[PDB]
Coordinates of C-alpha atoms (C1' of nucleotides) and ligand atoms in Angstrom, one line a residue:
Chain A
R28 CA 102.4 86.0 123.7
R29 CA 104.3 88.2 126.1
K30 CA 107.8 88.2 124.6
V31 CA 111.0 90.3 125.2
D32 CA 112.9 92.5 122.9
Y33 CA 116.7 92.0 122.6
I34 CA 117.0 95.8 122.3
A35 CA 114.9 96.6 125.4
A36 CA 116.6 93.8 127.5
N37 CA 120.1 94.9 126.4
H38 CA 119.5 98.7 126.9
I39 CA 120.9 99.4 123.5
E40 CA 119.8 102.3 121.3
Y41 CA 121.0 104.4 118.3
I42 CA 121.1 101.3 116.1
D43 CA 124.0 101.6 113.7
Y44 CA 123.9 99.6 110.4
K45 CA 127.5 98.6 111.3
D46 CA 126.1 96.5 114.1
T47 CA 126.0 93.2 112.1
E48 CA 126.3 91.3 115.4
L49 CA 122.9 92.7 116.4
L50 CA 121.2 92.9 113.0
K51 CA 122.0 89.4 111.7
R52 CA 119.9 87.7 114.3
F53 CA 116.8 89.6 113.1
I54 CA 117.4 88.0 109.7
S55 CA 116.2 84.7 108.3
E56 CA 118.1 82.7 105.7
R57 CA 118.7 84.4 102.3
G58 CA 118.6 87.8 104.0
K59 CA 114.9 88.2 104.7
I60 CA 114.0 90.3 107.7
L61 CA 112.2 88.4 110.4
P62 CA 108.7 89.7 111.1
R63 CA 107.9 91.6 114.3
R64 CA 105.4 89.0 115.3
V65 CA 108.2 86.4 115.0
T66 CA 110.9 88.3 116.9
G67 CA 109.0 90.5 119.4
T68 CA 110.3 94.0 118.9
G69 CA 108.5 97.3 119.2
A70 CA 107.4 99.2 116.1
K71 CA 109.9 102.0 116.6
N72 CA 112.8 99.7 117.1
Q73 CA 111.6 97.4 114.3
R74 CA 111.5 100.3 111.8
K75 CA 115.0 101.4 112.9
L76 CA 116.1 97.8 112.3
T77 CA 114.6 97.8 108.8
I78 CA 116.5 101.0 108.0
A79 CA 119.8 99.8 109.5
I80 CA 119.5 96.4 107.7
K81 CA 118.9 98.1 104.4
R82 CA 121.9 100.4 105.0
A83 CA 124.0 97.3 105.8
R84 CA 122.8 95.6 102.6
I85 CA 123.7 98.5 100.4
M86 CA 127.1 98.8 102.2
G87 CA 127.9 95.1 101.7
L88 CA 127.9 94.2 105.4
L89 CA 124.9 91.9 104.7
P90 CA 123.5 90.2 101.6
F91 CA 120.2 90.9 99.8
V92 CA 119.9 87.2 98.9
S93 CA 121.6 84.0 100.0
Chain B
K4 CA 133.7 64.3 77.4
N5 CA 134.5 62.4 80.6
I6 CA 134.1 64.6 83.7
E7 CA 133.4 64.1 87.4
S8 CA 130.3 66.1 88.3
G9 CA 128.1 69.0 87.2
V10 CA 124.7 70.6 87.9
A11 CA 121.1 69.7 87.3
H12 CA 119.0 72.6 85.9
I13 CA 115.3 71.7 85.9
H14 CA 113.2 74.4 84.4
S15 CA 109.7 73.1 85.3
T16 CA 106.6 75.0 84.2
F17 CA 102.9 74.4 83.7
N18 CA 103.4 73.3 80.1
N19 CA 106.8 71.6 80.1
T20 CA 109.9 70.6 82.1
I21 CA 113.3 71.0 80.6
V22 CA 116.2 69.2 82.3
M23 CA 119.7 70.4 81.5
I24 CA 123.0 69.0 82.9
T25 CA 125.9 71.4 82.9
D26 CA 129.4 71.7 84.3
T27 CA 129.8 73.9 87.4
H28 CA 131.4 76.7 85.3
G29 CA 128.4 76.5 82.9
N30 CA 129.2 74.8 79.6
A31 CA 126.5 72.3 79.1
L32 CA 126.8 68.5 79.0
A33 CA 123.3 67.3 78.2
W34 CA 119.6 68.3 78.0
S35 CA 116.2 66.9 77.3
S36 CA 112.5 67.7 77.6
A37 CA 109.0 66.2 77.3
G38 CA 108.6 67.2 73.7
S39 CA 112.0 65.7 73.0
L40 CA 110.8 62.4 74.5
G41 CA 107.7 62.7 72.3
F42 CA 105.0 64.0 74.6
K43 CA 102.2 66.2 73.4
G44 CA 99.3 68.3 74.7
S45 CA 99.1 68.3 78.5
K46 CA 101.4 65.2 78.7
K47 CA 104.4 67.6 78.7
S48 CA 103.2 69.0 82.0
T49 CA 103.5 65.6 83.8
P50 CA 105.9 64.2 86.5
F51 CA 106.2 61.1 84.2
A52 CA 107.4 63.3 81.4
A53 CA 109.9 65.0 83.7
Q54 CA 110.9 61.5 84.8
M55 CA 111.6 60.4 81.2
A56 CA 113.4 63.6 80.5
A57 CA 115.7 63.0 83.5
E58 CA 116.2 59.4 82.4
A59 CA 117.3 60.3 78.8
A60 CA 119.5 63.2 79.9
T61 CA 121.2 61.1 82.6
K62 CA 121.7 58.3 80.2
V63 CA 123.5 60.6 77.7
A64 CA 125.5 62.3 80.5
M65 CA 126.6 59.0 82.1
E66 CA 127.6 57.8 78.6
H67 CA 129.9 60.8 78.5
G68 CA 131.0 60.1 82.1
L69 CA 130.1 61.6 85.4
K70 CA 128.9 60.5 88.9
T71 CA 127.2 63.2 90.8
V72 CA 125.4 66.6 90.5
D73 CA 124.0 69.6 92.3
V74 CA 120.4 70.5 91.7
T75 CA 119.3 74.0 90.6
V76 CA 115.5 74.1 90.6
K77 CA 113.5 76.8 88.9
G78 CA 109.8 77.3 88.2
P79 CA 106.3 76.0 89.0
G80 CA 105.1 72.5 88.2
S81 CA 105.3 69.1 89.9
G82 CA 108.0 67.4 87.8
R83 CA 110.6 68.4 90.4
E84 CA 110.2 65.5 92.8
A85 CA 109.8 62.8 90.1
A86 CA 112.8 64.1 88.1
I87 CA 115.0 64.2 91.2
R88 CA 114.0 60.7 92.2
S89 CA 114.8 59.5 88.7
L90 CA 118.2 61.2 88.9
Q91 CA 118.9 59.2 92.0
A92 CA 117.6 56.0 90.4
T93 CA 119.5 56.4 87.1
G94 CA 122.6 56.9 89.3
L95 CA 123.6 60.5 89.8
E96 CA 124.0 61.0 93.6
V97 CA 122.1 64.2 94.4
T98 CA 124.8 66.2 96.1
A99 CA 122.6 69.1 97.1
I100 CA 119.5 71.1 96.1
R101 CA 118.7 74.8 95.8
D102 CA 115.9 76.7 94.1
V103 CA 116.7 79.8 92.2
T104 CA 113.1 80.8 91.6
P105 CA 113.5 84.4 90.4
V106 CA 111.9 86.9 92.8
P107 CA 111.2 90.0 90.7
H108 CA 111.5 92.3 93.7
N109 CA 108.4 94.1 92.1
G110 CA 110.6 94.7 89.0
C111 CA 108.3 94.1 86.0
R112 CA 104.6 94.5 85.0
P113 CA 103.2 91.0 84.5
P114 CA 100.5 90.5 81.8
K115 CA 96.7 90.5 82.4
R116 CA 94.8 87.6 83.8
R117 CA 93.1 85.0 81.5
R118 CA 89.7 86.7 81.8
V119 CA 88.5 90.2 81.2
Chain C
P21 CA 76.5 52.0 94.3
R22 CA 76.3 54.9 96.8
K23 CA 76.2 52.5 99.8
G24 CA 79.6 50.8 99.3
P25 CA 80.6 47.4 97.8
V26 CA 78.5 44.3 97.4
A27 CA 79.7 40.8 98.2
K28 CA 78.9 38.3 95.5
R29 CA 77.6 34.7 95.7
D30 CA 80.3 32.1 95.7
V31 CA 81.3 30.0 92.7
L32 CA 80.2 26.4 92.3
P33 CA 83.1 24.0 91.3
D34 CA 83.1 21.9 88.2
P35 CA 81.9 18.3 88.7
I36 CA 84.8 16.5 86.9
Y37 CA 87.8 18.8 87.1
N38 CA 86.8 20.5 90.4
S39 CA 87.5 24.0 89.3
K40 CA 85.9 27.4 89.4
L41 CA 87.2 28.9 86.2
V42 CA 85.5 26.1 84.3
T43 CA 82.1 26.7 85.9
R44 CA 82.4 30.4 85.5
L45 CA 83.3 29.9 81.8
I46 CA 80.2 27.8 81.4
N47 CA 78.2 30.7 82.8
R48 CA 80.0 33.1 80.4
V49 CA 79.4 31.1 77.2
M50 CA 75.9 30.1 78.3
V51 CA 73.0 31.8 76.6
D52 CA 69.4 31.7 78.0
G53 CA 70.2 29.6 81.0
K54 CA 71.5 26.5 79.1
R55 CA 74.1 25.1 81.4
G56 CA 73.8 21.7 79.7
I57 CA 74.7 22.8 76.2
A58 CA 77.4 25.1 77.5
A59 CA 79.0 22.4 79.6
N60 CA 78.9 19.9 76.8
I61 CA 80.5 22.4 74.5
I62 CA 83.3 23.0 77.0
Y63 CA 83.9 19.4 77.8
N64 CA 84.1 18.5 74.1
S65 CA 86.4 21.4 73.4
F66 CA 88.7 20.2 76.2
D67 CA 88.5 16.8 74.8
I68 CA 89.8 18.2 71.5
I69 CA 92.6 19.8 73.5
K70 CA 93.4 16.5 75.2
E71 CA 93.4 15.0 71.7
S72 CA 95.7 17.4 70.0
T73 CA 97.9 18.0 73.0
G74 CA 99.1 15.8 75.8
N75 CA 99.2 18.5 78.4
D76 CA 96.1 18.8 80.6
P77 CA 93.3 20.9 79.2
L78 CA 93.0 22.7 82.5
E79 CA 96.7 23.6 82.5
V80 CA 96.5 24.8 78.9
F81 CA 93.5 27.0 79.9
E82 CA 95.4 28.3 82.9
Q83 CA 98.3 29.2 80.6
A84 CA 95.9 31.0 78.2
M85 CA 94.3 33.0 81.1
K86 CA 97.8 33.9 82.3
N87 CA 98.5 35.1 78.7
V88 CA 95.2 37.0 78.3
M89 CA 94.5 38.4 81.8
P90 CA 95.6 42.1 81.8
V91 CA 97.3 43.9 84.7
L92 CA 96.4 47.5 83.7
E93 CA 93.0 48.8 82.5
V94 CA 92.2 52.2 81.0
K95 CA 89.5 54.1 82.9
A96 CA 87.8 57.1 81.5
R97 CA 87.7 60.5 83.2
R98 CA 86.1 63.7 81.9
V99 CA 88.2 66.7 82.9
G100 CA 86.0 69.5 81.6
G101 CA 86.7 70.2 78.0
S102 CA 88.6 66.9 77.4
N103 CA 87.8 63.3 78.3
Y104 CA 90.8 61.0 78.5
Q105 CA 92.0 57.7 79.9
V106 CA 93.9 56.8 83.0
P107 CA 95.9 53.6 83.8
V108 CA 94.4 51.4 86.5
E109 CA 95.9 48.5 88.4
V110 CA 93.3 45.8 87.8
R111 CA 91.8 43.9 90.6
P112 CA 92.5 40.1 90.4
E113 CA 88.9 39.2 89.8
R114 CA 88.4 41.9 87.1
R115 CA 91.5 40.3 85.4
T116 CA 89.8 36.9 85.2
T117 CA 86.5 38.3 84.1
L118 CA 88.1 40.3 81.2
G119 CA 90.1 37.2 80.3
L120 CA 87.1 34.9 80.0
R121 CA 85.1 37.7 78.2
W122 CA 87.8 38.3 75.6
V123 CA 88.4 34.6 75.0
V124 CA 84.8 33.7 74.6
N125 CA 83.9 36.7 72.5
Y126 CA 86.7 36.4 70.0
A127 CA 86.1 32.6 70.0
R128 CA 82.5 33.0 68.9
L129 CA 83.7 35.6 66.5
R130 CA 86.1 33.1 64.9
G131 CA 84.8 31.7 61.6
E132 CA 84.7 28.0 62.1
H133 CA 81.6 25.7 62.0
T134 CA 81.2 24.8 65.7
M135 CA 81.7 26.7 69.0
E136 CA 83.6 23.7 70.2
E137 CA 86.2 24.1 67.5
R138 CA 86.2 27.9 67.8
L139 CA 86.8 27.9 71.5
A140 CA 89.5 25.2 71.4
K141 CA 91.4 26.9 68.7
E142 CA 91.1 30.2 70.5
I143 CA 92.4 28.8 73.8
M144 CA 95.4 27.1 72.1
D145 CA 96.3 30.2 70.2
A146 CA 96.0 32.2 73.4
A147 CA 98.3 29.8 75.3
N148 CA 100.8 30.1 72.4
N149 CA 100.4 33.9 72.4
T150 CA 98.8 34.2 68.9
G151 CA 95.1 35.0 69.4
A152 CA 92.8 38.0 69.0
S153 CA 92.3 37.9 72.8
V154 CA 96.1 38.4 73.1
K155 CA 95.8 41.2 70.6
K156 CA 93.2 42.8 72.8
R157 CA 95.5 42.3 75.8
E158 CA 98.4 44.0 74.0
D159 CA 96.1 46.8 72.9
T160 CA 94.9 47.6 76.4
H161 CA 98.5 47.4 77.8
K162 CA 99.9 49.6 75.0
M163 CA 97.2 52.2 75.8
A164 CA 98.0 52.0 79.5
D165 CA 101.7 52.6 78.7
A166 CA 100.8 55.4 76.2
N167 CA 98.7 57.1 78.9
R168 CA 101.1 56.1 81.7
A169 CA 101.7 59.8 82.4
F170 CA 98.5 60.1 84.5
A171 CA 100.0 57.8 87.3
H172 CA 99.1 60.6 89.8
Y173 CA 95.4 60.4 88.6
Chain D
rG8 C1' 98.4 113.8 104.9
rA9 C1' 92.4 118.2 104.2
rA10 C1' 91.5 114.9 100.4
rG11 C1' 93.5 112.5 96.0
rG12 C1' 97.4 109.9 97.5
rC13 C1' 102.1 108.4 99.7
rG14 C1' 106.2 102.2 100.7
rG15 C1' 114.2 100.8 98.3
rC16 C1' 118.4 104.0 100.2
rU17 C1' 121.0 108.9 101.4
rC18 C1' 121.2 114.0 101.4
rU19 C1' 119.0 119.7 100.7
rC20 C1' 114.5 122.6 101.8
rU21 C1' 109.9 122.5 103.9
rG22 C1' 104.7 121.6 106.0
rG23 C1' 101.1 119.7 109.5
rU24 C1' 100.2 116.7 114.1
rC25 C1' 100.7 114.8 119.4
rU26 C1' 102.3 115.1 124.3
rG27 C1' 103.4 117.6 128.8
rU28 C1' 104.6 122.5 130.4
rA29 C1' 100.6 126.9 132.6
rA30 C1' 105.3 131.6 131.2
rC31 C1' 102.4 134.9 127.6
rU32 C1' 97.9 137.3 124.4
rG33 C1' 93.1 137.4 126.5
rA34 C1' 87.1 135.2 123.0
rC35 C1' 91.3 136.9 118.9
rG36 C1' 86.8 131.5 117.6
rC37 C1' 83.6 128.2 114.4
rU38 C1' 80.9 127.8 109.9
rG39 C1' 81.7 130.1 105.4
rA40 C1' 77.8 131.4 99.9
rG41 C1' 80.4 133.9 96.1
rG42 C1' 85.8 133.4 94.8
rC43 C1' 91.1 131.0 95.1
rU44 C1' 94.0 126.6 95.5
rC45 C1' 94.9 121.2 95.4
rG46 C1' 92.9 117.1 93.0
rA47 C1' 93.0 109.1 91.1
rA48 C1' 93.2 107.1 86.3
rA49 C1' 92.1 108.1 81.3
rG50 C1' 93.0 112.1 77.9
rC51 C1' 95.2 116.8 75.1
rG52 C1' 99.7 120.2 73.6
rU53 C1' 105.6 120.6 73.0
rG54 C1' 110.0 117.9 73.3
rG55 C1' 112.6 113.6 75.2
rG56 C1' 112.2 108.4 76.1
rG57 C1' 110.2 103.7 75.7
rA58 C1' 112.5 97.7 79.3
rG59 C1' 108.1 95.2 80.2
rC60 C1' 102.7 95.6 79.9
rA61 C1' 99.0 97.0 76.6
rA62 C1' 93.6 99.8 74.1
rA63 C1' 93.4 100.3 68.5
rC64 C1' 95.0 96.7 65.1
rA65 C1' 96.9 91.9 62.6
rG66 C1' 96.8 86.7 62.4
rG67 C1' 95.4 82.1 64.5
rA68 C1' 91.5 79.5 67.1
rU69 C1' 86.4 79.1 69.0
rU70 C1' 81.5 80.3 67.5
rA71 C1' 75.5 79.5 63.8
rG72 C1' 77.9 84.1 63.8
rA73 C1' 82.4 86.4 67.6
rU74 C1' 83.2 93.4 65.3
rA75 C1' 84.7 89.3 72.5
rC76 C1' 86.4 86.2 76.1
rC77 C1' 91.7 82.2 74.7
rC78 C1' 96.7 82.4 72.2
rU79 C1' 101.0 84.7 69.5
rG80 C1' 102.5 89.6 68.2
rG81 C1' 101.6 94.7 68.8
rU82 C1' 100.7 100.9 68.1
rA83 C1' 99.2 105.1 71.0
rG84 C1' 99.7 105.2 76.0
rU85 C1' 102.0 103.8 80.5
rC86 C1' 107.6 107.0 82.1
rC87 C1' 110.4 112.3 82.5
rA88 C1' 109.9 118.2 82.4
rC89 C1' 106.3 122.1 81.6
rG90 C1' 101.4 123.6 80.4
rC91 C1' 96.1 122.1 79.9
rC92 C1' 92.0 119.0 81.6
rG93 C1' 89.2 119.1 86.8
rU94 C1' 86.0 113.9 86.1
rA95 C1' 85.4 108.7 89.7
rA96 C1' 81.7 103.3 93.3
rA97 C1' 86.7 111.0 94.2
rC98 C1' 82.9 105.6 99.3
rG99 C1' 83.5 105.5 106.0
rA100 C1' 78.3 105.5 99.5
rU101 C1' 78.1 109.0 106.9
rG102 C1' 79.8 117.8 105.8
rA103 C1' 82.6 120.8 109.5
rG104 C1' 82.9 122.4 114.8
rU105 C1' 81.8 121.8 120.1
rG106 C1' 79.9 119.4 124.4
rC107 C1' 77.4 115.1 127.1
rU108 C1' 76.2 110.0 127.3
rA109 C1' 77.6 101.9 129.9
rA110 C1' 81.6 99.0 129.6
rG111 C1' 85.0 95.3 127.4
rU112 C1' 89.3 94.4 124.5
rG113 C1' 93.7 94.7 121.3
rU114 C1' 97.0 98.3 118.9
rU115 C1' 100.3 103.2 117.3
rG116 C1' 102.7 107.8 119.4
rG117 C1' 103.5 110.0 124.2
rA118 C1' 103.3 111.6 129.3
rG119 C1' 102.8 110.7 134.6
rG120 C1' 102.8 107.4 138.9
rG121 C1' 104.0 102.2 141.8
rU122 C1' 106.9 98.5 141.5
rU123 C1' 110.9 96.0 138.8
rU124 C1' 118.8 94.7 139.0
rC125 C1' 117.3 96.9 134.3
rC126 C1' 114.1 94.8 130.8
rG127 C1' 109.3 94.1 132.0
rC128 C1' 104.5 94.4 134.3
rC129 C1' 100.7 97.2 136.6
rC130 C1' 97.4 101.9 137.4
rU131 C1' 96.0 106.7 135.4
rU132 C1' 95.7 110.1 131.2
rC133 C1' 95.8 112.5 126.1
rA134 C1' 95.8 112.0 120.9
rG135 C1' 94.5 108.4 117.0
rU136 C1' 93.6 103.4 114.9
rG137 C1' 90.2 98.3 115.0
rC138 C1' 86.6 94.6 117.0
rU139 C1' 82.3 93.2 120.7
rG140 C1' 78.4 95.5 123.1
rC141 C1' 74.4 98.3 127.2
rA142 C1' 71.2 102.5 126.9
rG143 C1' 69.1 105.0 123.0
rC144 C1' 68.5 105.4 117.7
rA145 C1' 66.9 102.8 113.2
rA146 C1' 61.6 100.9 108.0
rA147 C1' 65.0 97.2 108.6
rC148 C1' 70.2 96.0 107.8
rG149 C1' 72.8 97.9 111.3
rC150 C1' 75.2 102.3 114.6
rA151 C1' 76.8 102.7 119.4
rU152 C1' 83.0 107.9 123.2
rU153 C1' 86.3 107.0 115.5
rA154 C1' 77.6 107.3 116.7
rA155 C1' 73.8 106.7 112.3
rG156 C1' 72.4 108.4 120.3
rC157 C1' 71.0 113.6 123.0
rA158 C1' 71.9 118.7 121.7
rC159 C1' 73.4 123.5 119.4
rU160 C1' 75.9 127.0 115.2
rC161 C1' 76.8 127.3 110.0
rC162 C1' 77.3 125.6 104.9
rG163 C1' 75.9 122.4 100.8
rC164 C1' 71.8 119.3 99.0
rC165 C1' 66.4 116.5 98.1
rU166 C1' 61.1 116.9 97.2
rG167 C1' 58.1 110.4 92.6
rG168 C1' 60.3 107.5 88.0
rG169 C1' 61.7 108.7 82.9
rG170 C1' 62.6 112.5 79.5
rA171 C1' 67.8 114.2 81.2
rG172 C1' 72.3 115.5 83.7
rU173 C1' 69.4 116.1 77.8
rA174 C1' 68.0 121.1 75.3
rC175 C1' 68.5 126.7 75.4
rG176 C1' 71.7 130.4 77.4
rA177 C1' 76.2 131.8 80.1
rC178 C1' 81.2 130.6 81.8
rC179 C1' 85.5 127.4 81.3
rG180 C1' 88.6 124.5 77.9
rC181 C1' 93.5 123.8 72.3
rA182 C1' 89.9 119.8 71.9
rA183 C1' 87.5 116.0 74.1
rG184 C1' 84.1 117.8 76.8
rG185 C1' 83.2 120.1 82.1
rU186 C1' 80.1 123.6 85.8
rU187 C1' 75.2 125.7 86.1
rG188 C1' 70.6 123.6 84.5
rA189 C1' 64.8 123.1 82.8
rA190 C1' 60.3 122.3 80.2
rA191 C1' 57.0 119.7 76.9
rC192 C1' 55.3 114.7 76.9
rU193 C1' 54.9 110.0 79.6
rC194 C1' 54.0 106.0 84.0
rA195 C1' 51.0 104.7 88.6
rA196 C1' 54.4 103.2 89.8
rA197 C1' 60.1 103.5 90.4
rG198 C1' 62.8 102.3 95.0
rG199 C1' 65.2 100.5 100.1
rA200 C1' 65.6 96.7 103.7
rA201 C1' 64.0 92.2 105.2
rU202 C1' 60.8 87.3 104.9
rU203 C1' 59.0 82.6 102.5
rG204 C1' 59.6 79.9 98.4
rA205 C1' 61.9 78.7 93.7
rC206 C1' 66.4 78.9 90.9
rG207 C1' 71.9 78.8 90.2
rG208 C1' 76.8 76.5 84.0
rG209 C1' 77.3 78.4 93.8
rG210 C1' 79.3 75.3 98.0
rG211 C1' 78.6 71.1 101.4
rC212 C1' 76.1 66.0 102.9
rC213 C1' 73.2 61.9 101.2
rC214 C1' 70.4 58.8 98.0
rG215 C1' 68.2 56.4 93.3
rC216 C1' 69.5 51.1 87.1
rA217 C1' 71.1 57.9 87.9
rC218 C1' 76.3 57.2 86.0
rA219 C1' 80.1 53.4 86.4
rA220 C1' 80.8 48.0 85.9
rG221 C1' 78.2 44.5 82.9
rC222 C1' 74.1 41.4 80.3
rG223 C1' 70.4 41.8 76.7
rG224 C1' 67.7 44.8 73.5
rU225 C1' 65.2 49.4 70.3
rG226 C1' 66.6 52.3 66.2
rG227 C1' 68.2 48.8 60.1
rA228 C1' 64.4 44.2 57.5
rG229 C1' 59.3 41.7 57.5
rC230 C1' 54.8 41.4 60.1
rA231 C1' 51.2 42.7 64.3
rU232 C1' 49.1 46.7 67.0
rG233 C1' 48.3 51.9 68.2
rU234 C1' 49.3 57.0 67.0
rG235 C1' 50.2 61.6 63.5
rG236 C1' 49.2 63.4 58.7
rU237 C1' 46.8 62.5 54.1
rU238 C1' 42.7 60.7 51.6
rU239 C1' 37.7 59.5 52.6
rA240 C1' 30.6 60.1 52.4
rA241 C1' 32.5 58.6 57.1
rU242 C1' 37.4 57.0 57.9
rU243 C1' 33.1 58.1 65.6
rC244 C1' 34.9 60.5 70.0
rG245 C1' 38.6 61.0 73.7
rA246 C1' 44.1 60.7 75.2
rA247 C1' 49.5 64.7 73.6
rG248 C1' 57.0 65.3 77.3
rC249 C1' 58.4 62.4 81.7
rA250 C1' 52.7 61.5 83.3
rA251 C1' 49.5 60.3 75.0
rC252 C1' 50.5 56.4 71.3
rG253 C1' 49.5 46.8 72.4
Ligands
K4 K1 101.9 113.1 76.4
K5 K1 69.8 76.0 97.0
MG6 MG1 97.7 110.6 83.6
MG7 MG1 79.6 97.2 116.3
MG8 MG1 76.3 51.9 81.5
MG9 MG1 62.0 47.8 63.4
MG10 MG1 52.0 48.9 77.5

RNA sequence: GAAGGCGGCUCUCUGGUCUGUAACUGACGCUGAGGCUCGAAAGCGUGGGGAGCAAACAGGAUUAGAUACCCUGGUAGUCCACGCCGUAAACGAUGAGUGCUAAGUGUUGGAGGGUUUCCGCCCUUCAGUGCUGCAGCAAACGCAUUAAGCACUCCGCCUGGGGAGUACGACCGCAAGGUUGAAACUCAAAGGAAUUGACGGGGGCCCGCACAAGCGGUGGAGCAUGUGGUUUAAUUCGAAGCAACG
């Protein structure tokens, strides 16, 4: 279905791993990253989100599990 | 001996379930299993065997003294539901449930399949 | 059969006691269509029961059937390389059939000189929970409880 | 990414590709034997390391046997650095390059335009990546702007099956063995695709004293009868799973 990206709608870019406020909504319980087909992001932005989230995880901003 | 509450550790597998009741900081308070009850062969892999295990462990634990438990599930098998129902029946109020099924994160090489 | 259940012909009551268990027991103990001999055997046996006990023979027989009728059968199931049993909640008719069968068989197995005496002694023993039929009941129930693990199957 | 192959994260160095741009060179290109380079996994050499897994191997089981499948252990090896090996169902089982040839649909990276408060939607276009499908092609299966169509350039390769990827020779390699590569003799077939059947310790649906539920029997005794062997002068001939044997 035609769905909208948060990022595109918000006109946000240069996704920093610090942005927990934006990254935490693309995460399901126990830290798993929501699929693109669930959320509705583009491939480029989705990959940037993956990298930012993994950075946040290693930097303690977000958990790997739980 | 007499305490308030602990945890329910239920290590269910394809061959056996092992129920273990422990204090929240870890030091155990009771345990039991199908072989302990007296099951053999494939009977160890049964919800009824898990039920009897939970019964015996809860009896001993209540004999020590407690009221409620948290539930820490782990492993395959179908004894989970029957054992939890039997915890409720024998008296322990099921405070909460969580599975801690270990996700290897691609960590180790598992063995071959049961053919070739 | 493949085409579903079959409804059975009704039971004819007993002329004197007006019961169905009695007539069906006649049919059980009968051999080669001899309702006359079977009925005479049964009525003389219940005459013995009236003789040695003031309770009604029908009530004593009801008590025996309550004490012999099982509740749980074992049913066989072949899971590949191992065939094993499964407990089974028994239908109320199957209960009575097995009861009459056990009673009559162990009665005629008893070592007395007439089927009258054999059956009467067996029924009284069953009503007092002492007979081979009750042993059979206990055996089936113990096996059901020993294989109780297969409640799911 | 040329392939093999490459998935945590950050940094250092580095390669190729795509889009527009139309400034510049001005046919400088393509293919490319022979050579050079890279090249899954196994494997070899030297030295580290070794959690788990695991050839070999041990024991238990199974089995008529089980030098196997199953189980419990477990060595090399799997891993790191260098140097060798250079093989694969190394497969899109389809060489590379260029052009032309209905359309549909998704999708990745862009660009342009017409809208849209932006987002977004729409139209066009390039480079890839999938599915459906017209023409045509195809022995058929199937392919079809990512061709197996129409065409052209070059390279590699085939001329029945086996013997045989063997032998001889040469080259390569520490070795294992690799690359090149026949003949004698032998068959009148080997093979591909598809069709009908049959079969399946393949699936689905259904049925039958088929199982289940039950009742009563045979097999044990004696006799009757028939049959097989055997004896016999002959023990007349026929009948041989179900479907021969009162
Ligand atoms: K080595
Ligand atoms: K078939
Ligand atoms: Mg290797
Ligand atoms: Mg197609
Ligand atoms: Mg049967
Ligand atoms: Mg016989
Ligand atoms: Mg006949």
